[PDB]
From a paper:
We isolated and characterized two Shigella podophages that have notably different features when compared with classical podophages and instead are most closely related to phage N4. We describe the isolation and characterization of phages Moo19 and B2, including whole-genome sequencing and analysis, cryo–electron microscopy (cryo-EM) structure determination, mass spectrometry, host range studies, and enzymatic assays of the tail proteins. Our work shows that these phages have divergent decoration proteins and unique tail structures, and encode and package their own phage-dependent RNA polymerase, and the tails, which display esterase activity, are dependent on specific O-antigen modifications of lipopolysaccharide (LPS) for entry. Moo19 and B2 are similar to bacteriophage N4—these are all T = 9 podophages, which encapsidate their own polymerases—a hallmark of this phage family.
We were able to clearly model several proteins with our C12-symmetrized maps including most residues for the portal proteins, tail adaptor proteins, and tail tubes for both Moo19 and B2. In addition, we were able to model the N-terminal residues of the tailspike proteins for both Moo19 and B2 but not the full-length proteins using the cryo-EM data as these are likely highly flexible at the linkage site. The portal shown in red was modeled from residues 17 to 675 of 760 total for Moo19 and residues 182 to 679 of 706 total for B2. The adaptor proteins were largely complete with all 234 residues modeled for Moo19 and residues 2 to 233 of 234 total for B2. Last, the tail tube shown in blue was modeled for residues 4 to 278 of 279 for Moo19 and residues 3 to 200 of 206 for B2. The tail tube of Moo19 (gp71) and the tail tube of B2 (gp34) both share a high sequence homology (>80%) with a number of phages that infect enteric hosts such as Shigella, Salmonella, Escherichia, Klebsiella, etc. In addition, Moo19 and B2 have C12 symmetry and not the proposed C15 symmetry of DEV. Some critical features differed between the two structures. Moo19 has an extra side appendage (composed of gp81, which is observed in the mass spectrometry data shown in Table 1). In G7C, this appendage is hypothesized to expand the host range; however, Moo19 and B2 have the same host range, so the function of gp81 in Moo19 is unclear at this time. Three major structural differences (see cartoon representation in Fig. 3B) include (i) the lack of the tail appendage, (ii) a single tailspike for Moo19 and a complex of two proteins for B2 (see next two paragraphs), and (iii) the completely different decoration proteins.
Author numbering:
A (entry chain C), I (entry chain C): 57 to 112
B (entry chain D), K (entry chain D): 30 to 87
C (entry chain B), E (entry chain B), F (entry chain B), H (entry chain B): 1 to 234
D (entry chain A), G (entry chain A): 407 to 456
J (entry chain E): 24 to 87
L (entry chain F): 36 to 83
Write the structure that this text describes.
């Protein structure tokens, strides 16, 4: 992680691609703002775990 | 004046009471062949169904 | 008397704040959900204009001989005459205030002579029955007549123009927002959004109850007891 | 002689029927049009005064 | 008086918003679920036109000698005569307003002379019994007779044409949507959709209760007490 | 008066929407579950025609000497005489309206002379006892007699032809669907489907309660008090 | 003769109608305008004094 | 009489403390959510000025011949005359106190002669009906007339200037904050924020109940019984 | 992941194929819009875990 | 007994035209009376309508 | 003075009772061709619909 | 009939406006051909 959102790391890339895959719904209805953020927040554990696996 | 049996019903009844005279007029139109004058083809097309003979004044 | 453009903005900040179509400046609604929101405001005003007596309007209806049933639609009016669906116009409206097809309930109809004619009175010649809410059945179209029909009215239909002005009491705008929120949040079919729709809908009743518990929509009525002197009672 | 209608019982035109003599229709869920719709009367003189 | 095309759009934005057949522009319904929605609107209007007295119509029924049972169907009418299933036509309708087979309940039938004939009166010669809701059993077809039959009516059947106009009060459109939503969401048999169907159906009753708690559908009735003078009582 | 073909389609869109046998066009029912659905409509109409008095029909029963018990079956009729199970025909029906074996309850039987005969009156010579609902026990078959038997009736049995027309009030079609849904969803024995069957069955009662709370099935009865003048009481 | 209106029953102008003779409309949820809106009267003389 | 700038700061410390747009100094609100907060204060004051009678103002309305309907908008005033939407000005306001379009309910209107004219009295010539809350229908525009219209008022609209002063009782500022918190926290659609919105909204009622349980907003009214001497009663 | 929905990565491909396998239901009834999105959101954990396994 | 609300309903905004006409009935009557004196020039199309003028025609101007 | 039938209704009725005279004036304007004088083109453009002939005093 | 009078006035509103404008626009050229009668013209008579 480059310690910045949308950085040039692997944690950032995965964590900014999951949000870019959920914003495709939020910007087309089908979920309110609150639901989208909750999904985004509950992904940090998965992205961080999978970023280390990919990096190493 | 304002009729008690209804304004339009008075007209309908008045037409009804004169059906016999209108029946005679319709019969005379229907049986005796009639020739009529017409200005153009559109007016000729707009003729009644008992008009057998016509004449187009060009 | 706010404008539909302002209603879009105030909706984007209070009720539809987490909605997807909220633009990046947060002070407007994107051009893809505007038909949806406009279809919710129009229903919202219709409900609010139905419970409370908010707009009482009268449109005079001239008598045409041979016609007894007099639908109060806009196709029969003068300024909006539609020759394809109406044989002759019989309602009367001025160009500045045309008929807007906004009759919810007909309340009291007078005549061209000043004689009040009862409504839905089976045993009452000189009575105008209404066979369906937006109609009128005068059984004797006398000569030189007309009918000032006082009726409950709804807000004129919001076409979509962002310069059309909205006739709502300022105290009832906190209830129109809570009904747009209900309609919007209840269609997503998600558990989180559905539970929010109920809260917004129940708040609609709470605000519509405080408006009727303080006479902010002119619901309480008092009249002089003219019946007293007529029945005798010196 | 100051009738006090409850706020919600008689809707529009159903109070105009009431204030004209004609039979009216009331919403049952609000109450009863014999214990509500109060017709205020003279108070009862205390026995102490007499 | 809205159109079925407009009803499709307003349904697509409020009730059937999460439905699958909503087109990409979100302002219409795809051509594969339209038969389904149309079959829900038709049932929706039938229920609404059954509880409230929304459409009171009268169709005159001429007497044909030898026939006592007079079904009020559309096959026996004049403009819609069906020679394969009707021997002779006896109802009377004009070309502009043909009989639409829309009788729910028969309320009051007069005669060609003005004499009111009672309904379902066992001991009452001069009484027209109805052996089934859409029939009529006159036991004495006198010469030169007819019967203006005032009956509760339903909305004429919506064939599917997107230019057919819908006769519903503007205040009751928030209840037709909540019934289409009920019918649609209850058929998916999923736990999430079923729980939404109950909410939409219960809201149908709530709106149908506010319409009857404010006399927006003309349900309250008052009549002159003509019985008083007849029973004596000077 | 809809047709069984239309009932199949309307069932496929509202009640049996998630059912397996729904064809790919979604507007019909596959040819493997049609016997099942038809066996549910027939039961559905029987229940609806049992609670409400929807079809009151009378079939005259001629007297044959030596026979006192007169079962009102279709094997004893004239147009449907079955020589293998009936010695002689004694009911009378026309070819256009044959007897359909549709007696649920017998209500009132007159005679060939106009004398009303009481039903189930132990101490009443001139009384026709019914030892079982679809029978009749006249204890004195007098010469030249007949019996117009007014009885509650059920809808004639739906054989399966898709051109047979269904006699149901338009307001009660939202209850026939909710009973077909109950019968279908309750047989799958799955927890999800069973819980839906209860909802559909309870909705059947709710609609069957609104029909009886608004007199849409002609249940309320008023008659002239002819007893008053007979007991004296000048 | 000291009428005691409950705080919330009669809104604005619905108490001005009341204090002028005209028919008024009251909020049902607050109470009943015959047991509330108390018209204080003379107390009842104890039998002990007499 | 605080200022909108101070209201921003006091809101940032008590109600909107966990809000995102709170600046780094914690004593102000960022320039991206200010339209949102301002749209909540304006609604907040409107609700508070609706329940309680907080601002009673009177604006005189001159009579113009030929005009009976007199909308009390700001386009018809003198200092804010809008020639595009008003033919002539008839309200009267001074430059220091212009009309602010702030009529919620009209309470009592006098005349230029001192004669009080009743409101909404069907049988009362000399009565000014109001066909909609912000209008006035005088049926006889006599010469040399005017109408001091005492009406309930709302706080003048907060444009957004941080130097506009707010007219609220100091004891009711703990209720305006609890309503801004409700409006803000209820739009996030998150479970944590929604549950906080209910607490803030319920506290709004609790404070609005303590203000009315101690007569801090001048709600209790006592008047001399002038009716006594008029009805006789020596 | 290419940090864009429907990208040219493995996370995107798996996450845009599961959504293209659930939209086959949503566009044919059998689920409302809300149910489809909830299923789509609860797949991110699975797709991200299986994308790393496939990539490496 | 006041019919002014009817005027507001029908001739509401354009009542200024009616008021301006009402203030000028005397001027309109004077204009008509001077008009009948034919003390002016009248425009006529072609010579044909020149003959078709009142016995009191005092000037005329023919176009073409 | 303050009219009982309404201040504006009195004016409307007064105009109504004089329609015949106004009808004669309108007829005389309509049938007898009129030539009028005009200062500029803008005023000429602002002429009534029954004004057939004009004259622009430059 | 108040409605009849008001409607009769309203249907002739355009002609009333035309007549009032013609009265205000009054510019009919009057032929005098003599200074004496030209000096004896009314105050509203412009153009001669």
């Amino acid at each position: 992680t480059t310690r910045v959102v949308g950085g040039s790391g692997t944690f950032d890339a995965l964590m900014a691609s999951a949000a870019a895959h959920l914003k495709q719904e939020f910007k087309e209805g089908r979920i309110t703002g609150g639901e989208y953020t909750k999904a985004y927040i509950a992904i940090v554990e998965t992205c961080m775990g999978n970023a280390t696996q990919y990096l190493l | 004046v304002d009729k008690v049996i209804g304004n339009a019903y008075a007209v309908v009844r008045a037409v009804y009471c004169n059906l016999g005279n209108l029946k005679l007029l319709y019969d005379f139109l229907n049986t005796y062949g009639m020739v009529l004058g017409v200005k153009s083809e559109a007016e000729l097309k707009k003729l009644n169904k008992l008009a057998k003979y016509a004449r187009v004044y060009g | 008397m706010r404008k539909l453009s302002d209603v879009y903005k105030v909706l984007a900040l209070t009720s539809l704040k987490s909605a997807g179509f909220i633009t990046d400046d947060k002070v407007n609604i994107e051009a893809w959900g505007k038909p949806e929101v406009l279809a919710h405001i129009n229903e919202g005003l219709t409900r609010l204009h139905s419970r409370f007596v908010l707009r009482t309007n009268n449109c005079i209806v001239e008598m045409k001989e041979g016609r007894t049933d007099y639908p109060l639609l806009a196709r029969y009016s003068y300024e909006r005459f539609d020759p394809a669906k109406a044989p002759y116009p019989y309602i009367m409206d001025t160009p500045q205030e045309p008929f807007q097809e906004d009759v919810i309930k007909i309340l009291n109809v007078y005549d061209s002579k000043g004689i009040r004619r009862k409504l839905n009175d089976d045993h009452d010649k000189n009575g105008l029955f209404t066979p369906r809410p937006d109609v009128l059945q005068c059984m004797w179209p006398r000569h030189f007549e007309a009918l000032n029909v006082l009726y409950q009215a709804k807000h004129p239909e919001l076409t979509g123009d962002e310069n059309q002005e909205i006739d709502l009491p300022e105290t009832l705008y906190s209830a129109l927002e809570n009904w747009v929120g209900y309609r919007y949040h209840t269609g997503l079919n998600t558990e989180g959004s559905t539970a929010k729709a109920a809260e917004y809908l129940q708040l609609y009743e709470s605000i519509c109850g405080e408006v009727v518990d303080f006479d902010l929509a002119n619901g309480s009525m008092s009249n002089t007891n003219v019946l007293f002197e007529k029945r005798g009672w010196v | 002689g100051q009738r006090a209608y409850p706020k919600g019982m008689l809707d529009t035109l159903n109070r105009r029927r009431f204030e004209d003599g004609l039979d009216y229709e009331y919403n049952p869920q609000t109450g009863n049009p014999s214990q509500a719709i109060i017709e205020h009367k003279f108070p009862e003189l205390p026995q102490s005064a007499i």
